[PDB]
Ligand binder design. Structure first.
Ligand code: CDL
Ligand code: CDL
Ligand code: CDL
Ligand code: BCL
Ligand code: BCL
Ligand code: BPH
Ligand code: QAK
Ligand code: LMT
Ligand code: LMT
Ligand code: FE
Lengths: 276, 46, 48, 251, 299, 46, 47, 45, 47, 46, 48, 46, 40, 42, 46
């Protein structure tokens, strides 16, 4: 079915590949060629995860884990029962994410709007690819990718962080955390501001963007405006993710694996301004 | 009981039934493959 | 007026549906008989 | 429960949260259904009973406006339900094909909503989108280029007209529209700033959505120094239609 | 072209703002225009209304900051050279464990206690200021209740969990790298905070707020050519921009929000991040002392 | 009691009931399968 | 009249009741067989 | 007491009551199942 | 207001009370059976 | 005292009262369940 | 109709569809016979 | 059974069936290749 | 030819080509997975 | 995504590539001078 | 005349020059004060 206003927009055309073969909707969802491909990749991946779990000890959802290959295989294809399932789930996942971004591009073209959403999703895709492809390749073996498990990839994060002393002292990581915390702050501020203007105090009319500008001024000191806030939010989230990716690229390929991020900062303490 | 098709679109119902039956069959097959006694590929140690 | 169809269409679809459902169930029953011949389930409280 | 029991305060708190969060997701998904409902059933679906979904849409919400006025959402009068479209195929989910001219019909990327035919009044009960000739005290800040005077050119390289005036938003100092004296019919049409490259690439401002002659067909505003919400959607929709239906033979 | 920057920036008079209810004082009159601010957003840099609660909030906060800084200077023998050298490593450390919840000597956590008291009073006064600035314009108080969640996490970190543990020594220090080390040692001392479920939930809601604000910013910038950034007007009188946004997300993932309920989604994700965080912190030590053991007990 | 269908859309109520029944059935089956005594595939040692 | 008529409601309810009763009796047979296989409800000491 | 249905929509009230009842029954069953005395599946051990 | 006439209200309320009472009777029988299986409320020294 | 319902609409008052009372009852039940003396399920000495 | 096929075209398509489905099934059957001749599945409760 | 093509358009149904069948074949081939007994490329682990 | 009354080849051909290429890539990667058929 | 036309993009890209090429040629002359200092291949 | 003042308003291209000169003088004095030879306060170590 359609929203009460949707029929105007469900027009033909705007696809990238395939013509009108897949130019249709299934309920709410637009399909396109990339929608078929995305469901294909997602389902092959989920079935490989289920099979890897069937080979494993437990079905416990928290303990399910698809582990990367042993370091003995380096950057080569591992046997399916000794890490190859991880590589194939990774290929299926990157395929799913890419075809999902492309389906979003097709929807953008069909609606006649900008491509900001697929572009922004490409940043999360890039962070994932950094984690499972770029960083283990730079470090020489697929064993550096994280295991696909709800609580085993947390163990991977813990071990990876503690292998560099304390990961908090990673500078790009500090920048990324600052960006994430500011993104959460700005999301709360923006949501609350719009909800305050739309749902005012009792007996009050719905407030205007001028009131929003005034209260934003009184809080943050100045005003960015209705388009500035969405720009700033996009920028904050994207830069958080980009600096997370940089953070991961510089630890292991650049700073040695058994290195120390706390000790890297001694370059400042050891400046000739104050060292001797 | 034919009256059910005066309630539900038999086309959408048919597609939903197909999806649900396939999902259930896959789930049951994977359950069996995860057991040791009923694994029919490698055998009784799993 | 009903949610989509007419009693003629409903009865035709139901005839085909019941035929297909019966043969699907019959195939499933044969499958389960063969599966039980291969490996019975439902062990005793002590095991197999 | 007790120190040795399997049940403990942490997981009880977690299940309390799971209940609260399921309730909150239901509430949020319910708030999401204040526009666009009930659903329009497609081909082969019985249309006797409404399609709504498992969180049913809530009761219509009533907003109070400044001048004692009142707006109840959903805005069902904005839907434009029946338009100039025909299904490209009899099965459900098939796309539609514009029967006529999608620039005039307002279909596809060129669709608009039946908004109120009245301008936005902002705070001092005056239109906020006005020509600079009507908003005294504001100025284009010559730090950036000045659009006025530059003749606007289509997508196929044909000059469409000349930029005559810059329309700005008051209380949010921002240029929203360029007024364009059309080529040779003595008519002024609006051009949304996001649909124009006001950079002076060579000498002019360029719009790649429609071609040069199509500037004659841009929906004109009824007044001269104020634009209504309806005309705003109509203009932005005329320009959005070109993103799919113009492609001005530039191959 | 896309709306990451403004091509043509118009400039006009300074806006004094909406007149207030008869319960406030005359605001400042700075009202200056910065060019780059207008490049990325709006350009006005005032006028900041600073009333009683704002002034007392800044006074208490600067008392706290003065205490912290003077303690970091004293801990380094007043050397400004050594202060610049060691700055990120300096901190006003919390009281010693031997003192419990008493008022310890100044050099053993008394200064920490006084700085924490004054910082808490500053933050509560700033919260009251947000509440009044919203309700002096007739608006809702959603921003204030979003701020109250961050305040609840901050109180749990510095006040509530130290209370329930019976010792001010549990609380963070006032320093950059030292409070990072406090975070690390807090995770290490109480098992592994990855197995705190409310920590998992807080991370879920932080990632989800980043995801949601990327989605929403990108969506509004994508339909800004149709007037999408005027969200209040698009909610009161739905235009084609918000229709296109709703349709993008409905065709992408099967469901969409409205112009207002998307901001409820945003508010609730951003608020649930520190709410679940505060719960998980209050549980860590008074209720659960080893989170990995708890996780093993469950999964 | 039949009056309850003058309140609730029978299609929506019925698909809700089916989803709920299937969910409850798979949940009870999985619970039994997780116990040692009532596991019917591998048997009592679990 | 939240969608239906009196007659449709009565017909739907009759079919609903009879099929709910069939579901109940099939489930009762299922539980009798399950109990024959392995009874639950142990004594306070076990099985 | 019938006047309560003038206060609350019987449809929303009835759906909410059913959700509440099922959730409470599930919670009580899981609480009993987590104890050793009242676990009826594996038993007291 | 819920948009319900007092006739509708009394009708709904009578059916609701009947249903609530049957639910209570079933729950009471269930608790009697449960108590016969395992009594709760021990003494201060245990069961 | 009936004038209280001129200040708070009975609908919101009643739903907030119900959620508050149910939350309080749940809290008290779990507090008792956590003790040894007042645990009615597994009993004392735990 | 919903698909837009007249029953003539539906019958015409269905003939070729069942022909193709049955050729597919026959090929799958000889493939499974060959696979069994290479590796039988369904072991005994003790293993192969 | 020919009536199934009065419900579903044959082009899209056929392409979707082909995608489904190819995915099922891919999954069964992977599952066989992950075992030791049915690894037709390397043979058993030995 | 009967298949060509459906699936006009002006677009049902590049799809077949990318499908064949993807299948070839999958089989090559599966071969590289093994030791007997890893030709590198 | 960043508001900028194809003319500016193309001209800035030409500038970028010529800058890259000049950087690389200076890099290789620096490498050969360093080799004059230290041949790093024994 | 020098039009770097035309690109850079002396109202800001002179306060930045001064903050930079101050930073530089501070840095040099700190460097000298950290050495053992050029310290003029507790001058020579060892
Ligand atoms: C793990 C194995 C895989 C499991 C998958 C999930 C299994 C359960 C769901 C199965 C559904 C099967 C449906 C089969 C087709 C039925 C017949 C049909 O098409 O009729 C038209 C039918 C309804 O048409 P309509 O009436 O016009 O729609 C409007 C609504 O009626 C009323 O309007 P509305 O606005 O109220 O609702 C609109 C919207 C409702 O909103 C959604 O669809 C939201 C979907 C995502 C929900 C969020 C999930 C978050 C999960 C987090 C889990 C974390 C756990 C771990 C935590 C640690 O869509 C729907 O109505 C439901 C569509 C199906 C939802 C599920 C889709 C797959 C989710 C996979 C996860 O359309 C559909 O059902 C859509 C079919 C396409 C989607 C299904 C295929 C998805 C494949 C996903 C692969 C990757 C998975 C990962
Ligand atoms: C659990 C499982 C069952 C439930 C499952 C379902 C859950 C979800 C249901 C749907 C929720 C929908 C929703 O969010 O609606 C928002 C929606 C927002 O308003 P709107 O409809 O958009 O427009 C309203 C107008 O614009 C007029 O707006 P306005 O000017 O009145 O301001 C609107 C503003 C506020 O709306 C209000 O109603 C709040 C203000 C009410 C009047 C002033 C009272 C002040 C009381 C202070 C108490 C402090 C502690 C508060 C703790 C609250 C939670 C217990 O709205 C909000 O903030 C949104 C609601 C969420 C607030 C979250 C607050 C987080 C606090 C974080 C910790 C703070 C610590 C203290 C820090 C202090 C500063 C340093 O409606 C409401 O907020 C109404 C509901 C308010 C609920 C209050 C709490 C009721 C429950 C009490 C506890 C019961 C359990 C325990 C009993 C005792 C055991 C011993
Ligand atoms: C052996 C035993 C006996 C066997 C039988 C023997 C006899 C055999 C012959 C006779 C019987 C066979 C033939 C029966 C034919 C039946 C045909 C039929 O029912 O067609 C329906 C209908 C046929 O088309 P139609 O005639 O246009 O339908 C008109 C209706 O009035 C629909 O109108 P509407 O569009 O206004 O209503 C739409 C509504 C329809 O659904 C509902 O009304 C309720 C849906 C939400 C239920 C939520 C859960 C409630 C229960 C919780 C308990 C556990 C749940 C499952 C948990 C699993 C894991 C433990 O769905 C929604 O609003 C969208 C739901 C979005 C869900 C998003 C999240 C999904 C993933 C979550 C996990 C990740 O197609 C559908 O309903 C398509 C959507 C189906 C999926 C619904 C959502 C699934 C949710 C999964 C669980 C999520 C929460 C966990
Ligand atoms: C001790 C354990 C015993 C056992 C003891 C019992 C007892 C006792 C009972 C059953 C009952 C059932 N058992 Mg048994 N059962 C056992 C082993 C099995 C196995 C197996 C593989 O071993 C299977 C498949 C089953 C299956 C079944 C079902 C036939 C039935 C569940 C009711 C039901 O289906 O409600 C679901 C009903 C519906 C109408 C759901 C319809 C779903 C519709 C089509 C829409 C769903 C949409 C869906 C969400 C879409 C997504 C699908 C996914 C992709 C999967 N049992 C073991 C041996 N079993 C119950 C029964 O007989 O009830 C009559 C019952 O009381
Ligand atoms: C080794 C480190 C541990 C770890 C130890 C902790 C500890 C301890 C905590 C967290 C907390 C959090 N962790 Mg952790 N965390 C780990 C790994 C992670 C990873 C990861 C990828 O591995 C991520 C994404 C996170 C993310 C998070 C957040 C979800 C959460 C912080 C919520 C927040 O927004 O605070 C931001 C908001 C605040 C900090 C409060 C707001 C402050 C007030 C309101 C503002 C005052 C400003 C003041 C006036 C300015 C002047 C002051 C003076 C200058 C002094 N952690 C590992 C396992 N983490 C916190 C939490 O809530 O978890 C339960 C927390 O306490
Ligand atoms: C939804 C949860 C998120 C959130 C929300 C949130 N924060 C808020 C608000 C909201 C809704 C406000 O309304 C309020 C505000 O005014 O925002 C502009 C605020 C606020 N959150 C702030 C900070 C802040 N929020 C943080 C986190 C978060 N805030 C969460 C992620 C953090 C982190 C991650 O550490 C910080 C540091 C302030 C900018 C402001 C509260 C200001 C205040 O209480 O002032 C008290 C006065 C003094 C202490 C006197 C001196 C003031 C200066 C020191 C201000 C400097 C601000 C900032 C640059 C500090 C950064 C850290 C320093 C160590 C450098
Ligand atoms: C009777 C008692 C019991 C009542 C009190 C009870 C209270 C309620 C206690 C509550 C205390 C709790 C709540 C506090 C929680 C602690 C916070 C979580 C701190 C964590 C993070 C802190 C750092 C990140 C920031 C440190 C500041 C900065 C590094 C230094 C600034 C100082 C200098 C630079 C100023 C330069 C100035 C110079 C010296 C030049 O002049
Ligand atoms: C028509 C489609 C035809 C498809 C043809 C397939 C082409 C081959 C695909 C590329 C496969 C290369 O496969 C893999 O490549 C890497 C990258 O150098 C090789 O090289 C790697 O060796 C070792 C581990 O082996 C690593 O530690 C090292 O850092 C890296 O050099 C691997 O040893 C090889 O196993
Ligand atoms: C502003 C936020 C809200 C206001 C504050 C919220 C909490 C208000 C109630 C606090 C109740 C006091 O809480 C109670 O504190 C005391 C001492 O402080 C703790 O008592 C004990 O704590 C630990 C236990 O190992 C030890 O330090 C010591 O044996 C003892 O002090 C209790 O375990 C805790 O239950
Ligand atoms: Fe917004």
């Amino acid at each position: 079915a359609m929203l009460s206003f949707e029929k105007k927009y469900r027009v033909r055309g705007g696809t990238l590949i395939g013509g009108d073969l897949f130019d249709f909707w299934v309920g709410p969802f637009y399909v396109g060629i990339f929608g078929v491909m995305t469901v294909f990749f997602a389902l092959i991946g989920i079935a490989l995860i289920a099979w890897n779990t069937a080979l494993g000890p437990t079905w416990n959802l928290w303990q399910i884990s698809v582990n990367p290959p042993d370091a003995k295989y380096g950057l080569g294809f591992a046997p399916l029962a000794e890490g190859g399932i991880w590589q194939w789930v990774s290929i299926c996942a990157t395929g799913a994410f890419v075809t999902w971004a492309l389906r979003e591009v097709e929807i953008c073209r069909k609606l006649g709007i900008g491509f900001h959403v697929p572009f922004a999703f490409s940043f999360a895709i890039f962070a994932y690819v950094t984690l499972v492809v770029i960083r283990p390749v730079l470090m020489g073996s697929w064993s550096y990718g994280f295991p696909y498990g709800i609580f085993t990839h947390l163990d991977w994060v813990s071990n990876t962080g503690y292998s560099y002393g304390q990961f908090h002292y990673n500078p790009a990581h500090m920048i990324a955390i600052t960006f994430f915390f500011t993104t959460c702050l700005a999301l709360a501020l923006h949501g609350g501001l719009v909800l305050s203007a739309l749902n005012p105090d009792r007996g009050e009319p719905v407030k205007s963007p001028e009131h929003e500008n005034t209260v934003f001024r009184d809080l943050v000191g100045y005003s960015i405006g209705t388009i500035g806030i969405h720009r700033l939010g996009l920028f904050l989230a994207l830069s958080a993710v980009f600096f997370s990716a940089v953070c991961m690229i510089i630890s292991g390929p650049v700073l040695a694996e058994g290195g120390s991020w706390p000790d890297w900062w001694n370059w400042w303490r050891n400046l000739p301004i104050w060292n001797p | 009981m034919w009256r059910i098709w005066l309630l539900f679109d038999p086309r959408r119902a048919l597609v939903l039934l197909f999806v649900f039956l396939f999902g259930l069959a896959i789930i049951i097959h994977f359950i069996l493959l995860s057991t040791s006694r009923f694994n029919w590929l490698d055998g009784p140690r799993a | 007026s009903i949610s989509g169809l007419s009693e003629a269409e409903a009865k035709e679809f139901h005839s085909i549906f019941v035929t297909s459902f019966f043969l699907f169930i019959v195939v499933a029953v044969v499958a389960h008989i063969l599966a039980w011949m291969w490996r019975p389930w439902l062990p005793k409280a002590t095991g197999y | 429960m007790q120190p040795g029991a399997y049940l403990d305060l942490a997981q009880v708190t977690l299940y309390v949260f799971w209940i609260f969060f399921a309730g909150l997701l239901f509430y949020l998904r319910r708030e999401d259904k204040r526009e666009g409902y009930p659903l329009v059933a497609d081909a082969g679906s019985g249309t006797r009973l409404a399609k709504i979904g498992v969180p049913a849409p809530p009761d219509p919400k009533t907003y109070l406006l400044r001048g004692g006025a009142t707006k109840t959402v959903p805005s069902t009068s904005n839907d434009r339900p029946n338009v100039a479209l025909t299904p490209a195929a009899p099965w459900p989910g098939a796309p539609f094909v514009p029967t006529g001219n999608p620039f005039a019909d307002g279909v596809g990327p060129g669709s608009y909503a039946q908004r109120a035919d009245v301008p936005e009044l902002g705070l001092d009960n005056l239109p906020i989108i006005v020509p600079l000739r009507a908003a005294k005290g504001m100025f284009l800040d010559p730090r950036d280029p000045n659009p006025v005077g530059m003749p606007v050119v289509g997508c196929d390289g044909v000059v469409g007209g000349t930029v005559t005036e810059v329309w700005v938003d008051r209380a949010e100092v921002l240029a929203r529209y360029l007024e364009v004296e059309v080529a040779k019919s003595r008519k002024r049409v609006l051009l949304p700033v996001p649909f124009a490259l006001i950079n002076d690439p060579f000498g002019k401002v360029s719009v790649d959505a429609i071609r040069g002659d199509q500037f004659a067909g841009v929906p004109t505003t009824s007044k001269g120094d104020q634009v209504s919400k309806l005309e705003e959607d109509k203009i932005c929709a005329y320009y959005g239609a070109g993103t799919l239906y113009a492609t001005p033979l530039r191959s | 072209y896309q709306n990451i920057f403004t091509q043509v920036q118009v400039e006009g008079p300074a806006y004094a703002g909406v007149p207030l209810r008869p319960g406030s004082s005359p605001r400042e009159t700075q009202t200056t225009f910065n060019y780059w601010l207008g490049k990325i957003g709006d350009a006005q840099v005032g006028p900041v209304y600073l009333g009683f609660t704002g002034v007392c909030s800044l006074l208490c906060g600067f008392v706290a900051i003065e205490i912290i800084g003077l303690n970091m200077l004293a801990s380094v023998d007043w050397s400004p050279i050594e202060f610049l050298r060691q700055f990120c490593w300096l901190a006003l450390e919390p009281p010693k464990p031997e003192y419990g919840l008493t008022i310890p000597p100044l050099k053993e956590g008394g200064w920490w206690l006084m700085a924490g008291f004054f910082l808490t009073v500053s933050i509560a006064l700033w919260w009251v200021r947000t509440y009044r600035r919203s309700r002096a314009l007739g608006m809702g108080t959603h921003v204030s209740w979003a701020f109250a969640s961050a305040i609840l996490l901050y109180l749990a970190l510095g006040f509530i969990q130290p209370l329930l543990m019976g010792s001010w020594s549990e609380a963070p220090p006032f320093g950059v790298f030292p409070h990072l080390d406090w975070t690390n040692n807090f995770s290490i001392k109480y098992g592994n905070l990855y197995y705190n479920p409310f920590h998992c939930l807080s991370i879920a809601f932080l990632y989800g707020s980043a995801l949601l604000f990327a989605m929403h910013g990108a969506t509004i910038l994508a339909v800004s050519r149709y007037g999408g950034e005027r969200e209040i007007e698009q909610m009161l009188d739905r235009g084609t921009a918000l229709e296109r946004a709703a349709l993008f997300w409905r065709w992408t993932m099967g469901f969409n929000a409205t112009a207002e309920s998307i901001h409820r989604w945003a508010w609730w994700f951003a608020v649930l991040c520190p709410l679940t965080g505060a719960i998980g912190i209050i549980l860590t030590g008074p209720v659960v002392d080893n989170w990995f053991d708890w996780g093993v007990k469950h999964g």
